[PDB]
Design a protein around this ligand. Structure first.
Ligand SMILES: CCCC(=O)SCCNC(=O)CCNC(=O)[C@H](O)C(C)(C)COP(=O)(O)OP(=O)(O)OC[C@H]1O[C@@H](n2cnc3c(N)ncnc32)[C@H](O)[C@@H]1OP(=O)(O)O
Length: 167
């Protein structure tokens, strides 16, 4: 096609059955590893290939140029943002925002209207631009022991509005 494409992919059972998806998952694992260099690569690989986790992939000419790895908790009423990266050469063009907006549209469709994520300090502003806040409204009992945590990171929340804003 020669245009960007959004694919929501993952490992449903085993990743070997669809080699195109497998190659994209490896690409995602490598993008996440390169852009989240303090994350252990084995941790990234495990979660990207975990069947409870999906990744919204941004593909350009067969190559993964970014993605958001997430876990949906429909009963909890929230989705956990696990990894969020754009490949370095493709950064600062609007893709990181483009990815998050898409992810929001997907979730509105699935009637999940809250994102929770941990953020390292130097990424907080990206999440703030995407409407995330450090003020958590999801009760602690809804996410404690559901979401993964990290030493020193800041928990942030985005409240989605399904209502289309028109001025
Ligand atoms: C483990 C917990 C979950 C996580 O992944 S936390 C770590 C999140 N990801 C990373 O740190 C990976 C490394 N960085 C990246 O991959 C990219 O910088 C990132 C965050 C995906 C953004 O991708 P881009 O394609 O550059 O996004 P974009 O072109 O839509 O521009 C982003 C808009 O937000 C703004 N922003 C504010 N504080 C920022 C900050 N600290 N880092 C990045 N952007 C920031 C930025 O100025 C831009 O807005 P505007 O275009 O100026 O209006």
């Amino acid at each position: 096609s020669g245009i960007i494409e959004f694919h929501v992919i993952g490992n449903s059972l085993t990743p070997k059955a669809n080699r195109r998806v497998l190659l994209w998952l490896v690409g995602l694992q490598n993008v996440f590893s390169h852009q989240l260099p303090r994350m252990p690569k084995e941790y990234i690989a495990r979660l990207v290939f975990d069947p409870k986790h999906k990744t919204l992939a941004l593909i350009k000419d067969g190559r993964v140029i970014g993605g958001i790895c997430f876990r949906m908790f429909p009963t909890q009423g929230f989705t956990e943002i696990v990894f969020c990266a754009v490949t370095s050469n493709e950064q600062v063009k609007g893709y990181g925002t483009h990815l998050m907006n898409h992810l929001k549209e997907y979730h509105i469709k699935h009637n999940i209207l809250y994102f929770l994520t941990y953020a390292d300090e130097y990424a907080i502003g990206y999440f703030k631009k995407q409407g995330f806040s450090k003020d958590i409204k999801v009760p602690k009992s809804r996410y404690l022991g559901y979401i993964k945590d990290y030493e020193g990171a800041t928990l942030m929340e985005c409240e989605l509005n399904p209502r289309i804003p028109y001025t």
